């Protein structure tokens, strides 16, 4: 297995070693030249792969290719050909994020005397000329500019020496493009609206400023490792290659571009005065550090111990406060809008594994960050706060819920609906769900017991202390007796006949005594409650066939379990899956007046989004049954495709009506608020409004791909010019994500 | 094209364990484990609720069923459970990021299971609890006390 040996050698160069990086590269270059006779095929494929999947070690592998080009010109040429095939093929397949790494690899190959500087400037002329294409999306133009600008920390000096006139032109066109760019998306993607202590900048504005500072410093930067500089002798005698002319694959309607981004920023050098000086926001050093650290996480996300190791052992030309960069990059990913690159839970565990490797330094940085996140809560986007709450609570559960709560005493004098006390309330609630009510009461100071969650107990309407003058009290007691004694569906129905009040089918008291009682007797656990819903499923489906029946099941179920939101969430989930209720019912229930007082609480939105997700998966499932049965025809069954096509259309329709309902109810209550505020002259921006407008924002962020299907209907019928610009802004922001 | 080092996914590999009461070949058991969406969950507290396991294991995805590990005799929780997910991907993520973290301050340990059948919820040790709880010498407040030999 020389094939496997070669992969392992190529991967292992650049990692921690007793010898120098230069020595290892020279050595490996020798070993690979020797194997070119009968492993050229393999070595090309491997180096093309590491160009695409290991951008974090870019300059190690460009140097390697440069040394191989010196010893064998023809090998260099085939590699450069393969890279261009790979680049064109990546763009064709909408892998724009892989394509950047390929563009940077080619760029830095100029510094290795493998590619002629003229070729690279010609390619970048064609990239920036995409800014003059007419009737194409901003996000297309953006990407070609970003691929250019983000390559310059590596190759910017060499190009601006060899062709300074041609680069000033490119820069001119780039600058005038950036000046006329629409920034509508920015408030939807910022983690904080406040521009102090750090503004959350738009990604291209920031990169531009970084490249401007780099240029002002004669293209000199203090971070990128450049192994090729120590092979100046060998690389200068090597002959260069020319890239073909590049024609960007033209914009089709099947083209899909990266969403714009906003750069996360919480630290500067003042947050670590003892340690090495942190590169500033507007330095390319900061860009390159964070880009590599993000890329390391991308490479090793599945292996939490490996990932932590690779981050801690990140090399640079100069000393940097690495623990701060690692923590900042992690929260940048976790709080990214619309969504993180990886599953949220991974970040919790990655930070644990980092604390394990760096127990003397990292935990203090993490606690310092946690302090700063809390103090900046007043303008944090709600979507990000939910994540902050879920991380912090889960983190605390892995370290004995130890936290200096009195540091956050400033929340106690504030309005309970303000971000800080709300944050603390929600965290403690989340802690309780991982622990138990008493444990959480114990781990906080007595000043904080006003913010603890209440005891998660059942509320039975027809219990001991309740008077027997309530409607259907005598029927409830009969149901209690029947349920305890293994009664059947018919016997329950029979008992429910003795209850007061198509042609007329919905009785609110039948539902009320049935639900109150059944939930009470299965209140022992989730498994018991689920078993009860299964056993008396036929009674549920008859009582709640009506749409007002479904809504009333949820109304009663809430009145029972309002102290135990976790229970509500799992019951609503089971009721949707067993079809007691439907998505539409849950949507209306959430915006109902009975939930009015709990509307700004996490659990409401956990339920909504969970409900939406079930709907989306339902449609996907039915869409795959259609696709599968069609491929069977392509190779009786034609009468089964017509039934599935009917099911897809009605499923897709249920999905669409779900979103339409949610948007209508949002538009209604937002308008109600805005009209009331223009009448009274009071502040629009209350805590309730902050939550409500940002929860609407979240529907778009979390489900942009599905909602893109409904653009024509939403422009024409819901989000029209008639709407208050406060509400319409959100929809315009949503449109900017792929405009 | 891919690199072996990056394809590495060691938290999702099969453990040493096999179910000895499994009606079938070993090759037939591995075939099910590689397709499973069900996880055995070890080293829980006896006092850890079903509702706590739901909250934690929900962080990797949507849970279909939790089957608590029960004492065969007493039918109380004896410190394991099963968690079944709707999708494989969500179970893989639990194995990657929930595996080896804390629940009621104990390092829980997850493994792929071949699938729930009746009787598998019950501890297979002499005394009713788990086999692991009989031979052990240590004192463990969260697992009854001393092991069942040294108790009585």
């Amino acid at each position: 297995e020389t094939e496997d040996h070669l992969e392992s050698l190529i991967c292992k160069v650049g990692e921690k070693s007793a010898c120098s990086l230069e020595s290892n590269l020279e050595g490996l270059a020798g070993v690979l030249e020797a194997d070119l006779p009968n492993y050229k095929s393999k070595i090309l494929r491997l180096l093309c792969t590491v160009a695409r999947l290991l951008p974090e070690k870019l300059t190690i592998y460009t140097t390697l290719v440069g040394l191989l080009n010196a010893r064998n010109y023809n090998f260099g040429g085939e590699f450069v050909e393969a890279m261009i095939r790979q680049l064109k093929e990546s763009l064709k397949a909408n892998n724009y994020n892989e394509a950047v790494y390929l563009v940077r690899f080619l760029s830095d190959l100029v510094n290795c005397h493998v590619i002629a500087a003229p070729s690279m400037v010609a390619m970048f002329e064609n990239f920036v000329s995409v800014t003059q294409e007419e009737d194409v999306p901003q996000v297309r133009r953006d990407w070609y500019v970003y691929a250019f600008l983000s390559s310059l920390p590596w190759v910017g000096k060499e190009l601006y020496e060899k062709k300074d006139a041609e680069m000033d032109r490119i820069f001119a066109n780039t600058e005038s493009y950036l000046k006329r760019r629409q920034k509508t998306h920015v408030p939807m993607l910022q983690v904080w609206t406040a521009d102090k202590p750090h503004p959350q900048e738009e990604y291209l504005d920031c990169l531009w400023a970084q490249i401007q500072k780099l240029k002002k410093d004669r293209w000199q930067e203090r971070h990128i490792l450049r192994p090729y500089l120590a092979f100046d002798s060998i690389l200068c005698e090597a002959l260069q290659h020319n890239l073909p002319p590049f024609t960007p694959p033209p914009h089709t309607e099947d083209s899909v571009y990266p969403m714009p981004r906003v750069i996360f920023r919480m630290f500067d050098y003042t947050d670590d005065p003892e340690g090495p000086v942190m590169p500033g926001s507007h330095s390319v050093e900061r860009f390159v550090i964070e880009e590599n650290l993000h890329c390391i996480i991308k490479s090793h996300w599945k292996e939490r111990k490996t990932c932590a190791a690779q981050l801690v052992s990140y090399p640079g030309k100069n000393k940097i406060p690495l623990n701060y960069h690692i923590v900042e990059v992690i929260f940048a990913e976790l709080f990214q809008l619309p969504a993180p690159p990886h599953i949220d839970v991974m970040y919790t565990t990655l930070l644990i594994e980092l604390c394990k490797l760096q127990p003397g330094s990292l935990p203090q940085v993490l606690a310092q960050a946690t302090e700063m996140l809390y103090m900046r809560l007043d303008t944090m986007n709600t979507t990000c706060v939910d994540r902050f709450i879920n991380w912090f609570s889960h983190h605390l559960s892995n370290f004995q819920f130890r936290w200096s709560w009195e540091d956050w005493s400033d929340c106690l004098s504030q309005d309970p609906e303000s971000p800080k006390p709300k944050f603390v309330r929600e965290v403690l609630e989340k802690c309780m769900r991982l622990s138990y009510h008493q444990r959480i009461l114990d781990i906080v100071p007595p000043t904080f017991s006003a913010l603890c969650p209440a005891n998660p107990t059942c509320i039975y309407k027809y219990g001991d202390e309740s008077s027997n003058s309530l409607p259907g009290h005598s029927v409830a007691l009969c149901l209690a007796v029947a349920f305890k004694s293994k009664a059947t569906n018919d016997e329950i129905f029979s008992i429910l006949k003795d209850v007061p009040n198509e042609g007329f089918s919905f009785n609110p008291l039948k539902i009320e005594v049935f639900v109150q009682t059944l939930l009470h007797l299965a209140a022992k656990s989730f498994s018991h409650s689920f078993s009860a819903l299964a056993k008396f499923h036929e009674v549920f489906k008859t009582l709640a066939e009506s749409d007002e029946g479904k809504l009333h099941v949820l109304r009663v179920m809430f009145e029972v379990w309002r102290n135990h939101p976790q229970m509500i969430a799992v019951l609503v989930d089971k009721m949707i899956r067993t079809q007691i209720v439907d998505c539409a019912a849950v949507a209306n229930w959430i915006f109902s007046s009975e939930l009015s007082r709990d509307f700004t609480r996490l659990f409401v939105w956990e339920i909504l989004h969970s409900t939406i997700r079930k709907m989306n998966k339902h449609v996907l499932k039915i869409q795959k049954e259609l696709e599968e049965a069609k491929e069977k025809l392509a190779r009786v069954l034609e009468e089964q495709i017509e039934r599935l096509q009917e099911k897809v259309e009605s499923a897709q329709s249920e999905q669409k009506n779900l979103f339409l309902v949610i948007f209508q109810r949002f538009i209604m209550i937002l308008t109600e608020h805005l009209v009331r505020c223009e009448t009274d002259g009071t502040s629009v921006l209350t805590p309730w409004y902050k939550n409500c407008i940002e929860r609407l924002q979240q529907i778009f962020l979390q489900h942009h791909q599905i909602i893109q299907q409904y653009m024509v209907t939403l422009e024409n019928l819901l989000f029209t010019a008639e709407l208050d610009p406060h509400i319409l802004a959100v929809f315009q922001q949503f449109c900017a994500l792929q405009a | 094209g891919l690199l072996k080092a990056l394809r590495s996914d060691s938290y999702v590999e099969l453990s040493q364990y096999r179910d000895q009461h499994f009606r079938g070949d070993n090759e037939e058991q591995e075939k099910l484990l590689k397709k499973s969406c069900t996880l055995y969950v070890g080293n829980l507290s006896f006092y850890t609720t079903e509702e706590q396991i739901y909250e934690l294991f929900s962080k990797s995805g949507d849970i279909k069923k939790i089957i608590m590990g029960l004492d065969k005799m007493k039918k109380t929780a004896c410190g394991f459970c099963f968690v079944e997910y709707y999708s494989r991907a969500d179970a893989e993520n639990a194995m990657r990021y929930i595996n080896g973290t804390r629940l009621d301050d104990r390092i829980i340990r997850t493994d792929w299971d071949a699938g729930f059948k009746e009787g598998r919820q019950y501890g297979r040790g002499r005394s009713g609890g788990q086999v692991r709880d009989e031979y052990r010498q240590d004192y463990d407040a969260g697992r009854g006390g001393y092991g069942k030999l040294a108790q009585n």
Partner: peptide
């Protein structure tokens, strides 16, 4: 510190 619950014999479309 807390009370264990006892589990019954009988406890185990869209």
């Amino acid at each position: 510190k807390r009370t264990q619950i006892v589990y019954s014999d009988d406890v185990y479309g869209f």
